[PDB]
Structure formats: C-alpha cells, structure tokens
C-alpha cells in the first residue's frame, strides 16, 4: 500500500500489461493451448489466448490490476528501477513467430531477444522472491476464500496442497510461474528499465533460535564415579558439527551454566577450537560431522589432553597439555554439552 508508482512505469504500465498478456498466450501456445470460443478445459479451445480484446475484459483488468501489484512489489523489494533511454522504447523490435506459435494477433507478442537480454544472478534472486510474494499472495487469497491444506486437492472441501511455502511447492506449478514471473522481469529489462537491486545481506543465527527457552543440555555421568588418581580416557562421537563442548567436570558443576565459563569443568567447545575453563582460549583444530574425539586425563600429575580422529590437539604453543595443572579437588567425571 505504501508503494508510489513512479511516472516512467505508471505511463508504460499499460503496455507492460498487454505485452505480457501477450506473452502469456505465447506461453499457452508453446505449451500446446489452442485458441477456441468458451472456456472448457477439456475442449483445450478458449478465449483466453485471444487478444486481450476478445479475452473477457474482467480477466483482462485483472490480470492488469495484478501486475501493477506485480510491478509495486518489486518497487517494495528494495530493487531501485532506472529507464535506460528513450530510444530503446522509439524502436522496439519483435521476433517474429511461426504460425503455429504465432497467435492470431498480426504483430508477434515476442518482445526483444531474450539472448540479448540478461539475467544476474541477483535479478534471479529478485525473481525468486517475487515469485514467493505472488505465491503468498496466492494464499492469503484462499484463506480468505477458507480454503484450508489438504494432501488430496478438494474443491468441496476447499483443500488445496497446494497451499504450502513455495519453497516446498511441486515443481510443476514452481516452474510455470517462475517462467511467467523471469520472463515478465525480462521483458521490464528489455524495455530499458535496469533494476538494480540492493545489496545482498548475511545473518547468522549462531543456534541462538531454540525450542524452549534453554539453550543447551549437559550430560554427565553420576557424581558417584569420580575419578580422584590414574588415568582415563573416554570418547566422544560428534554426530553434528556444532555448539558442542566436551571435558570433566567437578561433582559442583551447575546444569544451567555454560561449560568452562566457571571453574567447574574444564572443556573443548571444537566449534570455535577453544579450550573452556574460567574462560576460552585457542586449542586445536574445528570437528565436522562423525569426528571421534578422545579425552584423556591423568590425575597424577594433573594434566588434561585431547586427541581429535586420532591426532593430539595443539593450541597456539606446541604444549599437548589443554590444562598444565588443577588442583584434585573432589575428582572429575566426564561431561558434555
Ligand atoms: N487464466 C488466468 N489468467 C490470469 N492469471 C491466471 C490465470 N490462471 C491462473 N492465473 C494466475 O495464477 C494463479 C493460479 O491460481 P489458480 O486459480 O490456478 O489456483 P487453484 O489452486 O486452482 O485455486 P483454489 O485453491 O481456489 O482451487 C492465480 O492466482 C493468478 O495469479
Ligand atoms: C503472470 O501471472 C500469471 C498468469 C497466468 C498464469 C500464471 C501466472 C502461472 N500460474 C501457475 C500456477 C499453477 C498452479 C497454481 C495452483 O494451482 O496453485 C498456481 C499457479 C497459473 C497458470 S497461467
């Protein structure tokens, strides 16, 4: 609603809508659809692949009413739209068609070669998104009909599966107006009009989304099995390639507290390779998926050390010994995160 219409696209608008009206009894003959006086799917002859004149100007309004919606969002993708000059609209040049594709419509609706028109990668993204807008559009349309999903199609019922994110779509329909929606936006190009999109922007949500407002679980073994002398050696499979810490921890260790943010435990978060205890350091390399990593501690002289797949990590010194010494204390168990 907040979308102005600039005053090049409102006095070309008509043409737009035409030449793409066009366009589509183009893609209705290239797909096989023949021209005939009433509208019944079985027959494969309407009146809708004629002109837009002898097309029932309801239809013909609409589907322009539809594109200035069109034309407003792509105003709203934060794509800014620029004419090119003013000659490229004095000569327009048209293919012409064969016959059999060529409609009864004396002049061809096939605007300037699509070869000599161009498509970014960035302009393809502005046309998947367009497409996802027409096709919530779509359904915001049915739920105000109260058509509700439905895995079987049903028009009594008003079950449509069709009524799901475009991006888990079928194909068939995916295509067919992704073709209608690119070869619309490239015949905005044609006609001299260069969209130049905004620039493209990264998020990251770094598993701060979660269901349930904790963040994270810790499994250990029992209080009861601490290891006070010797030395252990236990392993972890890393089935994932995330926010995952593995190391001992203290019979006090809290179970809403991030591992090694405290004295507690004495952690290896492969994530970001740091080793964790009373803070972070760097130590070792990253695991990705099924990395076995082994953790090893010898309570005699205090020392802590992980083997990632086999091979000792190392932190920025050549020191194999993720924590030098610790006191005993109460004996550590193993723990992740
Ligand atoms: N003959 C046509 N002329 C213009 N646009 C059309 C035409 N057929 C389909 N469209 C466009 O493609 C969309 C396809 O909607 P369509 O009515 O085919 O969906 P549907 O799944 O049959 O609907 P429902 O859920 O009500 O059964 C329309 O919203 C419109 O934008
Ligand atoms: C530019 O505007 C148009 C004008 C005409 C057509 C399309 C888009 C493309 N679309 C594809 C489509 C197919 C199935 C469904 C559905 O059943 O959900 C929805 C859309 C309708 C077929 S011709």
């Known amino acids: 609603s907040q979308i102005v219409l ?5 006095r070309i608008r008509e043409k737009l809508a035409e030449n793409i009206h066009e366009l589509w009894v183009m893609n209705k003959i290239e797909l096989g659809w023949q021209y005939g006086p009433v509208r019944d799917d079985n027959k494969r002859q309407h009146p809708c692949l004629v002109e837009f004149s002898k097309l029932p100007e309801q239809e013909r309004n609409y589907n322009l009413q539809m594109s200035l919606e069109t034309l407003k969002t792509l105003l709203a993708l934060g794509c800014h739209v620029g004419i090119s000059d003013e000659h490229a609209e004095d000569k327009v040049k048209k293919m012409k068609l064969p016959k059999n594709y060529q409609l009864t419509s004396g002049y061809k609706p096939a605007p300037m070669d699509l070869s000599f028109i ?99 679980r810790i499994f250990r073994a029992e209080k009861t099995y601490a290891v006070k002398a010797g030395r252990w050696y236990f392993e972890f499979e890393t089935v994932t390639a995330g926010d995952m810490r593995v190391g001992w921890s203290r019979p006090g260790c809290q179970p809403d507290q991030e591992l090694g943010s405290d004295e507690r435990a004495f952690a290896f978060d492969g994530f970001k390779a740091q080793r964790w205890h009373q803070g972070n350091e760097h130590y070792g390399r ?52």
């Not at 600039?6 to 409102?10: D, F, V």
């Not at 559009?137 to 049915?142: E, G, I, L, P, Y």
């Not at 086999?310 to 550590?332: M, N, P, R």
Request: with cysteine; charged share 30%.
């Open 6 to 10: 600039p005053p090049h696209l409102e």
């Open 118 to 216: 161009k498509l970014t990668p960035s302009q393809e993204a502005m046309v998947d998104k367009l497409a996802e807008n027409a096709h919530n559009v779509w359904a915001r349309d049915r739920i105000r009909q109260g058509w509700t999903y439905g895995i079987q199609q049903d028009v009594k019922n008003r079950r449509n599966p069709r009524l799901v994110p475009y991006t888990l779509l079928d194909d068939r329909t995916k295509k067919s107006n992704k073709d209608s929606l690119r070869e619309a936006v490239r015949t905005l190009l044609g006609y001299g009009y260069n969209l130049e999109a905004p620039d493209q922007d990264h998020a990251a949500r770094a598993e701060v989304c979660s269901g349930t407002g904790e963040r994270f």
């Open 286 to 337: 990253s695991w990705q998926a099924g990395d076995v990593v082994g953790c090893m501690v010898d309570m005699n002289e205090h020392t802590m050390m992980f083997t990632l797949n086999g091979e000792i990590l190392l932190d920025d010194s050549g020191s194999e010994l993720a924590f030098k010494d610790f006191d005993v204390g109460d004996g550590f168990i193993p723990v992740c995160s």
